[PDB]
């Protein structure tokens, strides 16, 4: 099948070069155009430019001076290099394919997009705290437990429960930002706690951390 896959850093600093790669499979770059599109925070899609099949490039005229698109056909990759990023922005960037034969197709395949955080802040691993009922709260047959994943930067994290084994009513909520750090909660239900152990597994790739926190008591 046709596939496009964006990759790049999850965090850049203001004025670092932001290099993105779009890795393709199941078609030839010399037969199709590959476009770059961004979605700023709040907003709809914005065309940035195109890597034409024949090797030329074109750009959004307002962005031209800050973009460079290129490719490596031997490696099935198209690149977007850009500069002059916007402190605290969290744009998502996409690549997508089209062609023109008798007519111009719309974009027939997209990548799933990558989000880039722009900041001069340090990478910071989360502290993980238990969410357990206490302080005189009578425990029903099914209990809601959770983990508070506090004070990390940048996004994202992932949370699983009992290494994937527990998936009853799992909710992992959107993180909130304050004082430059993210905090999220994740909850699950159990009818067999505390006799049976409930543990959240929290990964924060940017800090290379993976921590388990058993919820008890």
């Amino acid at each position: 099948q046709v596939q496009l896959m964006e990759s790049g850093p999850g965090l850049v600093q203001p004025s670092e070069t932001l290099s993105l790669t779009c890795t393709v499979s199941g078609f030839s770059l010399t037969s199709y155009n590959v476009h770059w599109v961004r979605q700023p925070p709040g907003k709809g899609l914005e065309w940035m430019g195109v890597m034409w099949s024949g090797g030329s490039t074109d750009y959004n005229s307002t962005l031209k001076s800050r973009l460079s698109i290129s490719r490596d056909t031997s490696q099935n990759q198209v690149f977007l290099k850009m500069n002059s990023l916007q402190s605290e922005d969290t744009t998502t960037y996409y690549c997508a394919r089209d062609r023109t034969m008798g007519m111009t197709t719309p974009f027939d395949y997209w990548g799933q997009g990558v989000m880039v955080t722009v900041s001069s802040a340090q990478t910071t691993a989360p502290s993980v705290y238990p969410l357990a009922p206490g302080c005189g709260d009578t425990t029903s047959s099914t209990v809601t437990l959770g983990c508070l994943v506090k004070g990390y930067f940048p996004e994202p994290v992932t949370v699983t429960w009992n290494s994937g084994a527990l998936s009853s009513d799992v909710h992992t909520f959107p993180a909130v930002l304050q004082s430059g750090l993210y905090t999220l909660t994740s909850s699950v239900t159990s009818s067999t706690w505390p006799s049976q152990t409930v543990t959240c597994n929290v990964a924060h790739p940017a800090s290379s951390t993976k921590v388990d926190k058993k919820v008890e008591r």
Binding site: V50, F107, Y109, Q112, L131, C135, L148, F173, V176, T185
Partner: protein, 214 residues
Amino acid sequence: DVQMTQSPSNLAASPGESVSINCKASKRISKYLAWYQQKPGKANKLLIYSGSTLQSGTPSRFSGSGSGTDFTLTIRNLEPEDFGLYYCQQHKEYPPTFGAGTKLELKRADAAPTVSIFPPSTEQLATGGASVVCLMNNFYPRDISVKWKIDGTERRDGVLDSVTDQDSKDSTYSMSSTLSLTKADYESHNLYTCEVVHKTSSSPVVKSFNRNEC
């Protein structure tokens, strides 16, 4: 450029019902308008192109009309999988341009939130900080409001909250609210209450604890 104006930004319907979504081009573009579906965890997917032509694999309940400036996507007999976001793209000329999207919500029966309150952990208090959490799980509709009270007085300072997207299995929402405060502040008060208003109850659902029992 061809500016695409899409409407509406939002729809809500039940499985089995029908919705339509309009795009209007700022210039005539013959039949060259395409429709896409966006869904969490998936790349944007081409449904229709050239106004009315279904991509191979698109179910027959999707149809498109229009030529010139005015286009409409109609989705009949809605499946759960159809709830998500739709957008249009013209493919008459470069630059590619796009509608602003329509988010289609799955309208299910009302569901009252399961409300849980959680005191700070001793692990966190060791650090000099306290977070009190209130979860409001598996409710419908989206509309909800949560109040924190500390010794009977509303606290809005130090409260942040967030809400999940509609659940893939039961189409509900869930909300988390966190009251953050210093250990000293936390220990200067006794009663912590989160107060939750939703159309499923004629008065608020209240969960409380007294710190003196912790």
